[PDB]
Design a protein around this ligand. Structure first.
Ligand SMILES: *[C@@H]1O[C@H](CO)[C@@H](O[C@@H]2O[C@H](CO)[C@@H](O[C@@H]3O[C@H](CO[C@H]4O[C@H](CO)[C@@H](O)[C@H](O)[C@@H]4O)[C@@H](O)[C@H](O[C@H]4O[C@H](CO)[C@@H](O)[C@H](O)[C@@H]4O)[C@@H]3O)[C@H](O)[C@H]2NC(C)=O)[C@H](O)[C@H]1NC(C)=O
Ligand SMILES: *[C@@H]1O[C@H](CO)[C@@H](O[C@@H]2O[C@H](CO)[C@@H](O[C@@H]3O[C@H](CO[C@H]4O[C@H](CO)[C@@H](O)[C@H](O)[C@@H]4O)[C@@H](O)[C@H](O[C@H]4O[C@H](CO)[C@@H](O)[C@H](O)[C@@H]4O)[C@@H]3O)[C@H](O)[C@H]2NC(C)=O)[C@H](O)[C@H]1NC(C)=O
Ligand SMILES: *[C@@H]1O[C@H](CO)[C@@H](O[C@@H]2O[C@H](CO)[C@@H](O[C@@H]3O[C@H](CO[C@H]4O[C@H](CO)[C@@H](O)[C@H](O)[C@@H]4O)[C@@H](O)[C@H](O[C@H]4O[C@H](CO)[C@@H](O)[C@H](O)[C@@H]4O)[C@@H]3O)[C@H](O)[C@H]2NC(C)=O)[C@H](O)[C@H]1NC(C)=O
Ligand SMILES: *[C@@H]1O[C@H](CO)[C@@H](O[C@@H]2O[C@H](CO)[C@@H](O)[C@H](O)[C@H]2NC(C)=O)[C@H](O)[C@H]1NC(C)=O
Ligand SMILES: *[C@@H]1O[C@H](CO)[C@@H](O[C@@H]2O[C@H](CO)[C@@H](O)[C@H](O)[C@H]2NC(C)=O)[C@H](O)[C@H]1NC(C)=O
Ligand SMILES: *[C@@H]1O[C@H](CO)[C@@H](O[C@@H]2O[C@H](CO)[C@@H](O)[C@H](O)[C@H]2NC(C)=O)[C@H](O)[C@H]1NC(C)=O
Ligand SMILES: *[C@@H]1O[C@H](CO)[C@@H](O[C@@H]2O[C@H](CO)[C@@H](O)[C@H](O)[C@H]2NC(C)=O)[C@H](O)[C@H]1NC(C)=O
Ligand SMILES: *[C@@H]1O[C@H](CO)[C@@H](O[C@@H]2O[C@H](CO)[C@@H](O)[C@H](O)[C@H]2NC(C)=O)[C@H](O)[C@H]1NC(C)=O
Ligand SMILES: *[C@@H]1O[C@H](CO)[C@@H](O[C@@H]2O[C@H](CO)[C@@H](O)[C@H](O)[C@H]2NC(C)=O)[C@H](O)[C@H]1NC(C)=O
Ligand SMILES: *[C@@H]1O[C@H](CO)[C@@H](O[C@@H]2O[C@H](CO)[C@@H](O)[C@H](O)[C@H]2NC(C)=O)[C@H](O)[C@H]1NC(C)=O
Ligand SMILES: *[C@@H]1O[C@H](CO)[C@@H](O[C@@H]2O[C@H](CO)[C@@H](O)[C@H](O)[C@H]2NC(C)=O)[C@H](O)[C@H]1NC(C)=O
Ligand SMILES: *[C@@H]1O[C@H](CO)[C@@H](O[C@@H]2O[C@H](CO)[C@@H](O)[C@H](O)[C@H]2NC(C)=O)[C@H](O)[C@H]1NC(C)=O
Ligand SMILES: *[C@@H]1O[C@H](CO)[C@@H](O)[C@H](O)[C@H]1NC(C)=O
Ligand SMILES: *[C@@H]1O[C@H](CO)[C@@H](O)[C@H](O)[C@H]1NC(C)=O
Ligand SMILES: *[C@@H]1O[C@H](CO)[C@@H](O)[C@H](O)[C@H]1NC(C)=O
Ligand SMILES: *[C@@H]1O[C@H](CO)[C@@H](O)[C@H](O)[C@H]1NC(C)=O
Ligand SMILES: *[C@@H]1O[C@H](CO)[C@@H](O)[C@H](O)[C@H]1NC(C)=O
Ligand SMILES: *[C@@H]1O[C@H](CO)[C@@H](O)[C@H](O)[C@H]1NC(C)=O
Ligand SMILES: *[C@@H]1O[C@H](CO)[C@@H](O)[C@H](O)[C@H]1NC(C)=O
Ligand SMILES: *[C@@H]1O[C@H](CO)[C@@H](O)[C@H](O)[C@H]1NC(C)=O
Ligand SMILES: *[C@@H]1O[C@H](CO)[C@@H](O)[C@H](O)[C@H]1NC(C)=O
Lengths: 317, 173, 317, 173, 317, 173
C-alpha cells in the first residue's frame, strides 16, 4: 500500500470580514483596524507646550483684559481656547479678528516689549469702570488710552524706528465715543482721525460717534487694528483724537504653534496628536475622531472602520 | 483565489493547526500526525508584517492649518475654507478605501501563493514516487514511516531510495 | 488510439480596447464606460425642490424688485438663475455681492418676517419712477426708503431685540443721491451717516453724493448691506439721513440648498444629479459633463472616456 | 498574461463558444463536440460583477460648494478658487486613470487565472491517463466515449477504471 | 546517462534597492529615478516668451516708473520679477497689490491705449523731484497728475464710453498730501474726494492729509486703484481734488501668462518647465525642485527620490 | 516572489548571462553551454517599457496658479493659500509613493511570471522524456547532443523521436 501526505493551511473559528477590489466582504483569519475612532477625552500636556486659555481668548490675553493678566509674555505650542471664556474689559471689536488671532497664534508667544513713546501734550492711562483691574477703573494692559490734558489735545506725530533684526507686532485702537459730548470732553475736536504708517503701508481710521448696544455698562466701542513693522522700517503715528495707543510691541515669531477650540481637560500624559476631542494614538494611518488636529496625526477620513487583513482567507471546517 | 489552492483545490483549512499557517497531515503504517511548515508560514507572515510597517510610517505632522468649524455665517471665504477641507477629506477617504482594497486583495492572493509554492516544492521532491490526488494530498506509493514523512517535511527526502518500490507499485495491472 | 480533450476560452469578433498598467490599448471581449459624457439637456424637477429664477436673480428676489414679487417667501433646494435675468428697480450695487448671494442661497428660503420698527419722525415708503410697481412709483418690497417729514429728518435711533431662538438676516441700504440739492431735499443735512450695530459688530456707511452712470432714469445709486443678529443680541440703527431701512428680517436657515447658473429647461423627470448642462445619470462613478454639480453626482474628471474591462482578453481566431 | 494560459499556451479563443467563457472541446471515437464549463465561467463573472458594484457605491452628494465660473476678473481670491478646483479635478483624474488601469490589469490576470485553474483541475483528475500536449489539450490514452467525456466535464471521471488501458498505451515501444 | 537542461535568469553584481507594498528595500537589477531633483540653474528663454523684469516689478512697469519706461506695451508668457528690483518714483501703495499684480500678470501684456480725457479746467502733467525722468521732475508715465489752474480746481465730471469689443483696464490714483498747505496749494479745497463709477460699481476715495515715513524725499503718498470697464459700459470720473488720473487704458487679455519670483539668469536654451530655481527637464513624472512652476512640469512631491524598478529581482551568485 | 521561481526554486541568477534576461544552461555528451531565450526576455522588457511610457504621458501644463511664497504675514487668506498647496503636495506625494510601490510589486511578480512560463513551456515540450529536479533544471533521460539542445531551445524538439529511449531509462530497476 504505502502512505498519504496532505498539504493544508490553518483556519480559525472566529474569522473577520474585510473588503477587496472584488468583494465587499470576504472572511479572513485575522485583521487590524486602520481607523482610529476613540480619544481618551483629555488633551495630554506632553510633548507639546499646551497653554490653557481658561476664561481667556487669545485676543483677550493679547490686549490684556485684566482677568487675563496672567497670560502676559507667555508662550505655547498649542493655545487651547475654552468655550466658557468671557471678555470683561472695554467692549471691542477686531476687524478681521480671524486673521489677528491666526497670526498671533502662529507666532506662539505673547512676549511684549515696552517702548517709550513720546506722548507729551496728551494725558495717558485712561480707564473705564467696564474694565476693572482690582478696584481701580482701568484698561487693556498693553494699550494706552490717550485723552486731553489741560483741556487741549494737540495733534500727535510720534515715531518709532525698528533698529532691531526682528519684526515688531503693534496693536493699537480707535475709540468710538457714545456721544458728541464725550467726544469733545475727551478729545476737544468733534471728530478725530488715527493714521498709522510705515514706509510701505498706511491704515487711517475715523471714529463713528453714536451708541452701539449696551455692553458691560457702555454703549461705546473700541476697534482694534494692528500693524507689523519690519526691520529698518518705522512706525509713525498721527492722530487728532480718539487714539488707543500701543505701549510697545509683541515679538512676532513663526514656528509650529497654533490654536484650537476644545473643552477637553489637560492631563499628565504624552501623545503626539491632539484633537478637540482629546489626544489620540497615532499608531494607525487614518482617524475618524475629528478633522481638526495638531501634531503628528493620522489622516482624517470619512470611514469609521477600515480593516486590513493580516492573515489568509478563512475556510471553516 | 488567484492560485486556486486556498478556498479552491484544498477543500478547507485546519482549525487544529495552531502552530503554523501551513503544514502537513499524513497517514502511514505507523498512524497519523500533523506538523506545521515553518518557512512558508514565516514567508507569509514576513510579507504581511512588511505591509503593516509601510502603513505605519508617515508622520503627517501638521500644526497650523485653517479653521474647520465656524460659528458665524460669512459667505465666500468660508465656502472656500469648507470646500477645500471637504475636497481633502474625500480624496483621503478614497485613498484609504482603495489602499485597503488593494492590500486585502494582495494579501489573499499572496497567502494563496505560499500555499501553492509549498505544494509545488513538495511535489518536485516526490518525483515519480507519489501522485497528486487533486485535493491537496499526495498518494505515496511506498512504505513511508514517520522518519520518512519527516524527511519530506525537512526537505531531506531521497527519492532514489524508494523509486524502484514506488514505480513497481504505480505501474501495476 | 483514444481521445483528445482541449480546454479553451471564448472570444468575440468585436472586441474593445482598454488600458492597463502595462499597455495603453489591449483588446478584451467586453467593457463598460465609466465616464458620463451626456446630459438630457434639461434639469429634472425631482427629487430636488427646483426654483426657476426666471427673469430674477436671487438678489433681486431677496430685495423685492417688483417683477420678482412672486418669489416672496419662497423656498428651494436649488435656485436656478437664468442668464436673461434683468434688474428693473432702483439701480443698486452690493459690496461682496457674492457672499450675500451665497449665504441666502445656502439658507434656501426667502421667508421674510415683518417687524414694527419705530420710525416716528421720518416719512416712509419712498419710491422712484425707476422702480415701477404697477403704475405707482415704488421700491424694493422688503426695503423701506425713509425721507424727511415736514422738512425735518431727526436723528433716528431704533432698536430691535432678537427674543427668538433663530438667527435673523437683516437687509438694509444707503442712498447715494445724485446731487447736493437732492441730498438736502430728502435728508436736510448735506451728508448723512448710517450705523447698524449689534453687541459684537458695527457697520457704518457714509453716502457719496455725485452722479454715477445713467441707469434706468437715474444717475444715483443704493448700496446694499446686510447684518445678521443672533438670538439674544439686538439690532440698533442710527442714521442722520440716507438710510434705506429694513422692513423686517429673513429667517436664515442652513440646509442642502445652493444656487446654479443654467439655461437648461426644467422638466417632469427624476434625477439625483443636476449640472448646468442638465440633469445626468449617476450610475457611473465619474463624469465629464461639468465641474459644477448639485446632488448625488459622479465625480468630475478631465477624461472623456474611461473603459472598465468586463471580460477576458480577446484573442481572435 | 500573468499565467500564460490565455494569450499564451492556449493558441487563441473560440468564437463559437457562446454559452460560456471557458469550456471543453473533444475528439473521440464518436466524433467531436463542445461544452461550456459553468463554474469557472461563473467564478470569473462573479469577480467582475463584484468590481463593478464597488465602483457604483459612492454617493458623493455634494450640495453647496464654491463657484467655478466667473464673469469678472478679480485677482487673488478667484485665483485660489480656480486653483483649488483645478487641484481637485487633476487628483480625481489621476485616481480615475489609475483605478481603471489597476482594475483592467487585475481583470485580465484574474480571467487568465480561471483558465489555468480549470486546466489544473482537469489535469489532476486525469492522473496518469492523459498527457498535456502543451497547447491546452490533453491526449487521453484510452477509449473515452461521450459519456466518458461527460464524466470529465462533470467531475465524476473515475481514473482507476481506465488506468490499466491507459498505462499500457502510454508506455509502449 | 543523458543530459541536464537548466532554466535560469540573469543577475548583475551592482543591483539597486527599490520599495514595494511589502518591502521598503528589495534588490532589483535596474531602476530609473522618477523624481527630478536638479535644475540647470538658468531659466531657458524658449519656448515661452520670458520677460526679464530686471530692476522693475510688474507694478512699476505698469504705472510707468521712469527706469521702467522700456517695458511700455510689452508682452510675456512669464514675467520674471527680480529681488534686486527697486521703485524710484513717487512713493505709492496699492491696496490689494497682490490682486492687481495677478490680473495684470494673467493678461500677459502692458499694451496701453491713450485716450483723450476732457480735463479742461485743471492743469495736467504734475511732477515731483522724487520721480526724475531724465533731468525733469516727472511722474508715472501712464498716470496724469491733475492740479489747480489759475488758483481754481473745478469739480471734474469726465466720462469715457467703451464702444469697443474688449475689456479696458484703467489705473488711477489718489494723492495724499503731506500738509494742509500742500493740499490747498494744489487743490484749493482742504479735502478732495475721487469717485470712479461704472454702471455696475463705484469706488470712492478720500485723501488723508498727513506725513507718512520719509521715502525718496517725500512724506506724502499716492494710492493706486483700478477699475475694469466692460464693453458697452462707461467710466465716469468725479473728483473735487487729489485725483491721479489715467491717461487711457491697458488692454486686458487672458491667456497662459503668469509671473514668477526668481533670480535665475535667462539663457539660450529650450525647456517646457520653468521653476524659480531654473528650468528643469520634464521627462520624469514628479519633481522635487520647487512647488512653484510654470509650463509643462512634473508634479511636485515631498520625496527626493522615487525609483521605479525596470528589471527583475536581483539574486547574486 | 508570487510564483516562487525567481528568488525561490531557482537558487539564484546568472551573472554571466549578459545577452538576455532568461535562458538555458545545459550539460550533455558534447559539453556545456549557455543560451538566452529571446521571447521571454522581450516579453518582460515589453511589459516594463509599457509601464515606463504610461508614467511619461501626463503633460500637466499649468500656467497661472497661486503664489506659494509670501514675504508678509497676512492671516486668514494666506493660511488658506498655504493649506491648499500643502494639501495638494501631500496627496501627490501619496500617489507617487503608492504608484511606485504598486509598480515595483507588479514588476517583480511579472518578471517572476515570465520565468515560470518558460519553465512550464519547456516542461510541456519534454513530455515524458525528462523529469523536473526541483531546482530549475530538467534531467533529460536520453542522449541529447547540441543540435538536440538547440531543438528544445528553438521549440522544434520532437519528443516522439526519443520517447522509447527515455522511457526505458526512466523506468529502470
Ligand atoms: C438709542 O436707543 C438705545 C436703545 O433704546 C438706547 O440704549 C439704552 O440706553 C439706556 C440708558 O442708559 C440703557 O439703560 C440702562 O440699561 C442697563 C441694562 O439693562 C439690563 O437689565 C434690564 C432689566 O430690565 C434688561 O431689560 C436689559 O435688556 C439689560 O439686560 C441697566 O442695567 C442700566 O441701569 C443700571 O445702571 C444705571 C446707571 O448706569 C442705574 O441708574 C440703574 O439703577 C442700574 O444700576 C440702565 O437702565 C438701556 O439698557 C439701553 N438699551 C440698549 C438696548 O442699548 C440708547 O441710549 C439710545 N441713544 C440715545 C442717544 O438716546
Ligand atoms: C456728468 O457727466 C455725465 C456724462 O457726461 C452726465 O450724465 C448725463 O446726463 C444727461 C442729463 O440727464 C443724460 O441725458 C439723458 O440721457 C438718457 C439716456 O440716453 C440714452 O439714449 C441716447 C440716445 O442718443 C444714448 O446715446 C445714450 O447713451 C443713452 O443710451 C436719455 O434717455 C434722457 O432723455 C430722456 O429723458 C429726458 C428727461 O429725463 C427727456 O427730456 C428726453 O426727451 C428723454 O425722454 C436724457 O437725455 C445723459 O444720458 C447722461 N449720460 C451719462 C453717460 O450718464 C451727468 O449728468 C454729469 N453730471 C453733472 C452734475 O453735470
Ligand atoms: C512727524 O515726525 C516725523 C518723524 O519725526 C517727521 O519726519 C521727519 O521730517 C524731517 C523734516 O523734513 C526729515 O528730515 C529729512 O530727513 C532726510 C532723511 O534723512 C536720512 O539720513 C539721516 C542721516 O542722519 C538718517 O538718520 C535718516 O534716518 C534718513 O535715512 C534727510 O535726507 C533730509 O535732509 C536732506 O534734505 C534737506 C532738504 O529736504 C536738506 O536741507 C539736507 O541738507 C539734506 O539734503 C531732511 O533732514 C526726517 O527725515 C523725517 N523723518 C521721518 C522718520 O520721517 C515729520 O516731518 C513730522 N511731521 C510734522 C508735520 O512735523
Ligand atoms: C446717532 O449718531 C449720530 C452721529 O452720527 C448722532 O448725531 C448727533 O445728533 C445730535 C442730536 O441728537 C446733534 O445735536 C449732533 O450734532 C449730531 N452729531 C453729529 C456728529 O452729527 C445722533 O445723536 C445719534 N442718535 C441719537 C438718537 O442720539
Ligand atoms: C468629536 O467631536 C465631534 C464634534 O465635537 C463629534 O462629531 C459630532 O457628532 C455628533 C453625533 O455623534 C453630531 O451630532 C455633531 O454634529 C458632530 N459634530 C460636528 C462638528 O460635525 C465626534 O463624534 C466626536 N468624536 C468622538 C470620538 O467623541
Ligand atoms: C492579528 O494580527 C495582529 C496584527 O497583525 C497581530 O498582533 C500583533 O502582534 C505583533 C507581533 O506579531 C505585535 O507587534 C503587536 O502587539 C500586534 N499588533 C497589532 C496591530 O495588533 C496578531 O498576529 C493577531 N492578533 C490577535 C489578537 O489575534
Ligand atoms: C461730483 O461730485 C461732487 C461731490 O463730491 C460734487 O460736488 C459739489 O460741486 C458743486 C459744484 O458743482 C458744489 O457747489 C458743491 O458744494 C459740491 N458738493 C460737495 C459736497 O462738495 C460735484 O458737483 C460733482 N460734479 C459735478 C460736475 O457736478
Ligand atoms: C456643458 O457645458 C460646458 C460649458 O457650458 C461645455 O464646455 C464648453 O465646451 C466648449 C467646446 O465644446 C468650449 O468652447 C467651452 O469653453 C466650454 N465651456 C467651459 C466653461 O469651459 C460642455 O461641453 C457641455 N457639455 C455637454 C455634454 O453639453
Ligand atoms: C458587457 O458587460 C456589461 C457590464 O458588465 C453587461 O451588461 C450588464 O448586464 C447586467 C447583467 O449581467 C445587467 O445588470 C445590466 O443591464 C448591464 N450593465 C451594464 C453596465 O451594461 C454585459 O455582460 C455586456 N453587455 C453587452 C452589451 O455586451
Ligand atoms: C497729522 O495729520 C493731521 C491730519 O489729520 C494734521 O492735522 C492738522 O493739524 C494742524 C496743526 O498742526 C491744524 O492746524 C490743521 O487744521 C489740521 N488739519 C486737519 C485737516 O485737521 C496734523 O498737523 C498732523 N500732525 C502734525 C504733527 O503736523
Ligand atoms: C530651489 O529653491 C528652493 C528655495 O529657493 C530650495 O529650498 C530651500 O532649501 C534650503 C535648504 O537647502 C532651505 O533652507 C530653504 O528654506 C528652502 N526654501 C524654501 C522656500 O523652503 C531648494 O533646495 C532649491 N532646489 C535646488 C535643486 O536648488
Ligand atoms: C536601466 O533601465 C533603463 C530604463 O528602463 C534603460 O535605459 C533606457 O534605454 C532605453 C532603451 O532601452 C532608451 O530609450 C533610454 O535611453 C533609457 N531610458 C532611461 C530612462 O534611462 C536601460 O535598460 C538600463 N540603463 C542602464 C544605465 O543600465
Ligand atoms: C479569535 O479569538 C481569539 C481568542 O480570544 C482572539 O484572541 C482573536 O483576536 C480572535 N480573532 C478574531 C479575528 O476575532
Ligand atoms: C474663570 O472664571 C470663573 C468665574 O470667576 C471661575 O470658574 C474660575 O475661577 C475662573 N478661572 C480661572 C483660571 O481663574
Ligand atoms: C527534522 O528536523 C527537525 C527539526 O529541525 C528534527 O526535530 C527532526 O528530528 C528531523 N527529522 C528528520 C527525519 O530528519
Ligand atoms: C458586439 O456585438 C454585439 C451584437 O450587436 C453587441 O451586443 C456587443 O455589445 C458588442 N460588443 C462590443 C465589445 O462591441
Ligand atoms: C420675463 O420677461 C420677458 C419680457 O417681459 C418675458 O419673456 C417673460 O414673460 C418674463 N417671465 C416671466 C416669468 O414673467
Ligand atoms: C453531466 O451533468 C449534466 C448536467 O448536470 C447532465 O445533463 C449530463 O447527463 C451529465 N453527464 C454525465 C456523463 O454524467
Ligand atoms: C551597473 O554598472 C553598469 C556598468 O557601469 C552601469 O551601466 C549600470 O547602470 C549599473 N547599474 C546599476 C543598477 O547600478
Ligand atoms: C539696474 O540698476 C543697476 C544700477 O543702476 C544696474 O546694475 C543696471 O544697469 C540696471 N539694470 C538695467 C537693465 O538697466
Ligand atoms: C535554432 O535557431 C537559431 C536561430 O533561429 C539557429 O541559429 C540555430 O541553428 C537553430 N538550431 C536548431 C537546432 O534548429
Amino acid at each position: 500500500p504505502g502512505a498519504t501526505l496532505c498539504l493544508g493551511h490553518h483556519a480559525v473559528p472566529n474569522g473577520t470580514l474585510v473588503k477587496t477590489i472584488t468583494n465587499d466582504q470576504i472572511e479572513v483569519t485575522n485583521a487590524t483596524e486602520l481607523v482610529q475612532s476613540s480619544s481618551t477625552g483629555r488633551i495630554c500636556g506632553s510633548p507639546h507646550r499646551i497653554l490653557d486659555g481658561k476664561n481667556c481668548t487669545l485676543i483677550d490675553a493679547l490686549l490684556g483684559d485684566p482677568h487675563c493678566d496672567g497670560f502676559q509674555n507667555k508662550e505655547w505650542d498649542l493655545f487651547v481656547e475654552r468655550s466658557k471664556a468671557y471678555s470683561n474689559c472695554y467692549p471691542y471689536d477686531v476687524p478681521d479678528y480671524a486673521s489677528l488671532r491666526s497670526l498671533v497664534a502662529s507666532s506662539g508667544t505673547l512676549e511684549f516689549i515696552n517702548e517709550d513713546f513720546n506722548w507729551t501734550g496728551v494725558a495717558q492711562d485712561g480707564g473705564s469702570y467696564a474694565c476693572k483691574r482690582g478696584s481701580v477703573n482701568s484698561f487693556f494692559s498693553r494699550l494706552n488710552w490717550l485723552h486731553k490734558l489741560e483741556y487741549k489735545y494737540p495733534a500727535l506725530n510720534v515715531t518709532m524706528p525698528n533698529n532691531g533684526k526682528f519684526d515688531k507686532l503693534y496693536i493699537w485702537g480707535v475709540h468710538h465715543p457714545s456721544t458728541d459730548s464725550d467726544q469733545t470732553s475727551l478729545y476737544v475736536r468733534a471728530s478725530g482721525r488715527v493714521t498709522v504708517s510705515t514706509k510701505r503701508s498706511q491704515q487711517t481710521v475715523t471714529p463713528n460717534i453714536g451708541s452701539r448696544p449696551w455692553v458691560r455698562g457702555q454703549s461705546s466701542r473700541i476697534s482694534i487694528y494692528w500693524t507689523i513693522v519690519k526691520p529698518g522700517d518705522i512706525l509713525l503715528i498721527n492722530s487728532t483724537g480718539n487714539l488707543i495707543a500701543p505701549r510697545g510691541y509683541f515679538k512676532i515669531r513663526n514656528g509650529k504653534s497654533s490654536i484650537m477650540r476644545s473643552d477637553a481637560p489637560i492631563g499628565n500624559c504624552s501623545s503626539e496628536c491632539i484633537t478637540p476631542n482629546g489626544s489620540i494614538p497615532n499608531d494607525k494611518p487614518f482617524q475618524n475622531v475629528n478633522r481638526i488636529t495638531y501634531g503628528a496625526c493620522p489622516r482624517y477620513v470619512k470611514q469609521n472602520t477600515l480593516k486590513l487583513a493580516t492573515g489568509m482567507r478563512n475556510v471553516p471546517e | 483565489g488567484i492560485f486556486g489552492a486556498i478556498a479552491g483545490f484544498i477543500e478547507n483549512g485546519w482549525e487544529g493547526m495552531v502552530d503554523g499557517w501551513y503544514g502537513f497531515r499524513h497517514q502511514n503504517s505507523e498512524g497519523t500526525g500533523q506538523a506545521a511548515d515553518l518557512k512558508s508560514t514565516q514567508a507569509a507572515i514576513d510579507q504581511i508584517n512588511g505591509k503593516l510597517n509601510r502603513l505605519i510610517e508617515k508622520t503627517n505632522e501638521k500644526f497650523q492649518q485653517i479653521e474647520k468649524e465656524f460659528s458665524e455665517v460669512e459667505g465666500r471665504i468660508q465656502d472656500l475654507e469648507k470646500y477645500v477641507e471637504d475636497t481633502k477629506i474625500d480624496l483621503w477617504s478614497y485613498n484609504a478605501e482603495l489602499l485597503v482594497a488593494l492590500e486585502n486583495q494582495h494579501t489573499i492572493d499572496l497567502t494563496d501563493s505560499e500555499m501553492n509554492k509549498l505544494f509545488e516544492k513538495t511535489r518536485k521532491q516526490l518525483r515519480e514516487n507519489a501522485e497528486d490526488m487533486g485535493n491537496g494530498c499526495f498518494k505515496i506509493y511506498h512504505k513511508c514511516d514517520n522518519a520518512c514523512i519527516g524527511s519530506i517535511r525537512n526537505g531531506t527526502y531521497d527519492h532514489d531510495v524508494y523509486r524502484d518500490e514506488a514505480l513497481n507499485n504505480r505501474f501495476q495491472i
